[PDB]
Design a protein around this ligand. Structure first.
Ligand SMILES: Nc1ncnc2c1ncn2[C@@H]1O[C@H](COP(=O)(O)OP(=O)(O)O)[C@@H](O)[C@H]1O
Ligand SMILES: Nc1ncnc2c1ncn2[C@@H]1O[C@H](COP(=O)(O)OP(=O)(O)O)[C@@H](O)[C@H]1O
Ligand SMILES: Nc1ncnc2c1ncn2[C@@H]1O[C@H](COP(=O)(O)OP(=O)(O)O)[C@@H](O)[C@H]1O
Ligand SMILES: Nc1ncnc2c1ncn2[C@@H]1O[C@H](COP(=O)(O)OP(=O)(O)O)[C@@H](O)[C@H]1O
Lengths: 388, 426, 335, 425
């Protein structure tokens, strides 16, 4: 059901992925904790209590989206990201948010079912093999069970319409037959509805652009159409009837042009929690390259390891990589932490291409190797917009 | 099924939720009371007498919508709130959708009332079928043993194989956004025709119990009697609330603005609207409209609409004395909810009289310093005030936290004093 | 089948609801009587003879719509009212016949449920012998032969930029009056024999500003006089189930006997006449808002006033009204 | 089939309905005569020869549409009238809809022709199933006895229980564009539910007519009836496009000429899909009309001018023509008002001097304000007859004579005032 984690355990889990932005983490943790707190109340208070929506404020590239993505992934919750300006053009309907979110939940519950159906099909597949070895666990059945998993015993011929086969090729055929009987289409579609209603999470990006003569009537019309979603309503979908009352909504935006006070008063009352996010620094970039679990540099260490090349990133090399991304954002356009992705690939493109010929070597990326493939490019701002 | 409550008993019940706004409570009581007065007349007068619709006037956040919500909830009536500007575009949402979503809201209303009557019986037969798998076949011993262990025990995590019904079709249809409602109706037809059977599958008693209650409760209630009864709820008891009707009043946009009034005209004057649950007649449906009317006036409405809104009430703006009452008096007020939410973690929150008073002063000052959003400022102010407690409530378990006037001025006055920061955070 | 009533019998029944406007009652009586006259002709003349459509002219709130509603209710005919300006935006015009069919399906369905009730074995034969598709077929026969359509504010689509879009509504409405075949979910519907009644103020434009093809499809023209103070008094009392009789019976449910004096009925009408002259003239609709504001105190206290006789005089009217009617700024919001 | 009448026999028949406009009648007579002329040619010349489409020019109300209506009714051809401005919005209407409604008019036309032939076979099979209920089962005696008693006798008032078909089935919500589709889906569930007949008690009087309808559907093949209507549209189809002058030619000109480009594949010929099957528009005859006061036929796109070879100007009607329209045409408005008042028992008689002043009154209104053509005769007559039509119930058994004095009493007062003539007349 809903996870029992405390807000401190949720923020501690988010620190494995997002760097900094502790205030934003505490806001989503409190909202996720209220999901469990509402389950502990009586029947009257469960309907009266609605989720507390979060309005994030900050420049682009500070992690507003990754916090929401990891939260839904931490809460095992369906997630969708919608641009607020998509509805500005008009006839797309605003209800499409719930329609596409539901579709994401239907595929989610299917993959989670196949994951739980595989271990169940394999247990019953080898269980039917043990009936041929020892006709009816006692001893011999437990002996052939441990010898079938650990050993290469599968090469022996075993007759399992009865037909003779090899346990290696009979095991994969018995998994196909057992996995087809473990799926319930009715309970799968109903759980996808409960996933959207109870656990649903919706992230509305760049909601500041729809704030307030000609365009303002079109802008404030999106909020009036977004209003029944946050206040709760019924949306018809192909999969069934989806109620948005218990869905959590997380909005974000720059708010340089407008302010959250420019939103309609009915929407402000539906976005009670507000959190400002600080912009990232050069000291933060050095942290993002290494600290987060499966960071882009750790991934590249493992990717070249597939070819047999050991990549090592020195601190002086990581420092100039971070200094490179900061310089490009200042010289041209500030895209946030996304600059680290394009800068890392441009430096690593020569190693990634020749990695097949570098098998068996240890390549050390220092401050000098970084400045050779970068400083020439970072010096030209005209080249920095196309290449970086 | 019309409630016999007098106008004074209705206003007294509304006082349990809404604070003040006595004129608007007396308006909705008259409309609801006429529902019972009409049912006592002869056949000729029942059709000639039509509900008296209400046009509410007042600034935002004064409780216009909540009065309509509690009115329909008090009368056990289907209710829907629609924004008048939703139909300004006109290219598809249809104006008929107001009765459509009102019909579907009534079907769920009469369904939950049918589930509660069938609940204890469906749960009795659901667990009865579980006992047939545990002990294959007066109850003797083992059956009464597993029955008591199933209700009291957490043994539902065990694996049990029970036969259950399933729809073998499993077909998905691609549809453009307009056909999203229609294709779902086609999917229910193919499952209703061919498949009648039950297939043996392996489940867990925790998930198998909830799946058995749905199957047994469906057999107890008849769909033909329930679907036609919901239509009788929309025609007699239906209640519709049209928000921000002042924004559709009156060259370029005014033709599209007044077009919404023309489209809403057959609803209030009465007409026949087709729904998937049946044919619905809007003649006796009660309509309530609300608006600020700062830009326009009720005279700027089309003359055909003015006659269909005979009852007029303006609602007064809330004051600081009202904010102090809203924080406590109403049932399930925002402080009552937060008090119970922190109690989940084991923390006892207490709000002093002077603390509640300085919370209201903060919300009042923000509405004046920046933008007046009405009583909705109380949530943003309270959530900002309690965000430290709500995060630490896990570690504060077993402690009594008292919110005094000093605690309020510490976490708020700093923010309210700076107007530039007040707009972002509050 | 279809009831045969002389034009005087139609007007005499309309007098039980509408007050005055005798010129419009005589026009609608001719059209409904032609429904029975065409049934008595031969096969060749039935298709050649087309219904005579009516174009009504007059200010708002004079009873143009009530005359049409009571006419169809008297003939048990499907009725629909659509605003001509709804098609100014570039909804299809065929939706007029679609919503007319939907309203006729429920009409013949509710009327058929009563016939089946006229005890458990009789109801089991009612759910069997009655066919759901046969009711759909009976509705289509009611739309083609007896159908009545009312098009409000038709003068607003008269005639350079918007005039091409305004007159385009007339051109799209043309096949409906000339006759055509419109497809609906309930079946195929033919508009040849449907009666159409149009109305408008015609202060901005004139019927001559309509396209020439449309003028010939509206042979009957009638102007409705503006209601006066003497007419307002008659609307409060004379019509069957009048707004005052309704409010007299609603209070009677609580146990209170309400009586309206002749002096009060006169000043109630004078109050409504004063508001239409001071701010905006909404016609007889002003009586609805004025009555409710006068009776709002009695309607709320009717539970505690049970067993009492409350008499509404001219003094009680002047107490709850003259204060509000004198202030025009408040008259727009409250009245 | 294809009528063999000569151009002179066509025009002579059109004079029974339309008055004057001889140059236009000769144009439509040539186009209908070429339908028969092409039939007598060889296989190569039949396809190469295409119908000669007609463009009518003249003021409104001169009878352009009545010539097209009476022409198709004379040739027993499917006919449809469409306004050229209907497709200006082009939202969803597709121009292909002209052939769609034309096919539906042909299906109903050939269906009634199939009902008359199936009447004797259905009535034989309808009473055949009734005889199985009376005498349970060459005919021997009892079957031949009840057969002669059912046709000759009024014995149908007896209660007889016969089995008849019905379906248990549902409503579907759809946007206005799917209104035609959902009607087809509903018919498919009624056919799929089951094939059988439910037993119910009835009367032979009402059971015989209900048995004829069920048998008549089985006798006619839905593939033969549906495909025969396609042959009626391709060869005999006649389409009238009104006010084509309003789609002639910057901002509106792109949307106006866009209608001609969408109308172009219809006149040049193409394949249009209908619910009844595939229809080819190559040989369908098209007739266009317009006032052409604002624009000219040369303003049309060059590809459309080549597809409208026949050009005819229609003259404006005069006072002498209005006198003829009130009397000469079959089922004229004055004869129709004579029979309508006859239903109440009143005999109406129009004098020659009264008819003459009516025509002069209709001309004066067209001259004083706006000229709407012969349509003015409808409003002028109804205003004159409105007092008689209301009292027709109490005037039963009386003979009312409409003279020149009765015309000037109810009209000249109203016609003299031009401000009131616009509203009332
Ligand atoms: N605090 C952070 N820690 C780690 N990665 C981050 C952080 N902030 C941004 N990123 C990077 O930015 C990308 C996504 O940024 P996103 O959250 O979509 O920007 P925004 O906050 O403007 O929505 C991710 O690929 C991630 O690597
Ligand atoms: N008089 C009142 N008494 C209690 N709560 C109120 C009152 N007025 C407003 N509220 C609060 O404001 C919210 C309702 O605002 P709403 O009525 O929707 O705004 P509006 O009246 O502008 O439509 C509710 O959450 C309610 O708690
Ligand atoms: N002559 C009349 N007699 C009785 N009621 C009238 C009369 N004229 C107007 N009304 C009132 O006006 C309302 C309907 O007006 P309506 O006919 O819609 O206006 P319009 O004539 O502008 O269409 C009804 O509620 C009716 O009580
Ligand atoms: N020459 C005519 N003979 C008889 N009736 C006519 C004649 N011209 C017009 N009408 C009358 O006018 C109407 C037809 O006008 P129509 O042909 O549609 O106008 P247009 O010729 O401008 O398209 C019919 O009702 C018909 O009675």
């Amino acid at each position: 059901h809903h996870s029992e984690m405390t807000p401190r355990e949720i923020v501690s889990e988010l620190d494995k992925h997002i760097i900094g932005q502790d205030n934003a983490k505490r806001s989503v943790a409190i909202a996720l904790r209220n999901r469990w707190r509402r389950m502990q109340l009586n029947e009257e208070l469960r309907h009266e209590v609605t989720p507390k929506n979060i309005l994030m404020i900050g420049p682009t590239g500070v992690g507003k989206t990754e916090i929401a993505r990891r939260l839904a992934k931490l809460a095992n919750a369906p997630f969708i990201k919608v641009e607020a300006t998509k509805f500005t053009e008009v006839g797309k309907e605003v209800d499409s948010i719930i329609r596409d979110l539901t579709d994401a939940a239907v595929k989610m519950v299917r993959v989670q079912a196949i994951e739980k159906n595989r271990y169940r099909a394999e247990e019953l597949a080898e269980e039917r093999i043990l009936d041929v070895l020892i006709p009816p666990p006692s001893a011999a059945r437990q002996a052939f069970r441990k010898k079938l998993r650990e050993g290469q015993l599968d090469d022996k011929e075993i007759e399992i319409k009865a037909r003779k086969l090899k346990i290696k090729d009979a095991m994969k055929l018995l998994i196909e037959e057992e996995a087809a009987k473990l799926v319930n289409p009715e309970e799968l579609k109903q759980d996808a509805i409960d996933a959207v209603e109870q656990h649903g999470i919706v992230f509305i990006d760049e909601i500041d652009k729809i704030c307030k003569s000609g365009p303002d009537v079109s802008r404030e019309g999106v909020q009036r159409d977004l209003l029944p979603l946050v206040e709760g309503c019924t949306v018809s979908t192909k999969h069934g009837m989806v109620k948005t009352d218990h869905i959590l909504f997380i909005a974000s935006g720059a708010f340089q042009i407008a302010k959250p006070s420019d939103l309609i008063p009915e929407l402000q009352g539906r976005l009670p929690i507000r959190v400002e996010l600080q912009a990232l620094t050069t000291s933060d970039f050095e942290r993002i390259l290494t600290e987060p679990n499966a960071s882009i540099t750790v991934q590249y260490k493992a990717l070249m390891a597939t070819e047999g090349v050991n990549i090592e990133f020195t601190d002086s090399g990581i420092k100039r990589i971070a200094e490179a991304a900061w310089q490009v954002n200042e010289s041209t356009e500030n895209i946030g932490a996304r600059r680290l992705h394009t800068v890392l690939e441009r430096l690593m493109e020569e190693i990634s291409y020749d990695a097949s010929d570098l098998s068996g070597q240890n390549i050390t990326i220092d401050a000098d190797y970084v400045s050779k493939h970068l400083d020439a490019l970072v010096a030209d701002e005209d080249l920095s917009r196309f290449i970086l």
